[PDB]
Design a protein around this ligand. Structure first.
Ligand SMILES: [Cl-]
Ligand SMILES: [Zn+2]
Ligand SMILES: [Zn+2]
Lengths: 10, 118
């Protein structure tokens, strides 16, 4: 399936 | 000699469309596919797609991946990008600029081994 990106924190 | 399952599961045309879209939407981040290197003795992560601030360093990204795979501080972890271990002081943006593929993703493998893929 088409996962969302992990939004990596600064 | 890099082999990513992601590229088998998602075709180039659609990867590129996604990479273009996410590059445009987030000008101060870069899209990164992360997988365990083939045959390595480290856990797989559920998440393979990472949207990374361009100024995050490779070292900071190692720290994140190490944490997510639950490595002990004494355990080794290496990243491979185009069969090369990147320096920790580089930013992920620089690594992306020099190594992203034609679908606009950067592909990073992680491994317990200091040589890739076997
Ligand atoms: Cl896709
Ligand atoms: Zn897909
Ligand atoms: Zn091995």
């Amino acid at each position: 399936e088409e996962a969302e990106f992990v939004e990596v924190e600064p | 000699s890099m082999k990513f399952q992601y590229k088998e599961d998602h075709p180039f045309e659609y990867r590129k469309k996604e990479g273009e879209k996410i590059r445009k939407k987030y000008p101060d981040r870069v899209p990164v596919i992360v997988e365990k290197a083939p045959k390595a003795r480290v856990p797989d992560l559920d998440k393979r797609k990472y949207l990374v601030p361009s100024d995050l360093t490779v070292g900071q990204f190692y720290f994140l991946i190490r944490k997510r795979i639950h490595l002990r501080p004494e355990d080794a972890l290496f990243f491979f990008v185009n069969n090369t271990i990147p320096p920790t002081s580089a930013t992920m943006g620089q690594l992306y600029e020099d190594n992203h593929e034609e679908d606009y993703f950067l592909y990073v493998a992680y491994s317990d081994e200091s040589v890739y893929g076997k």
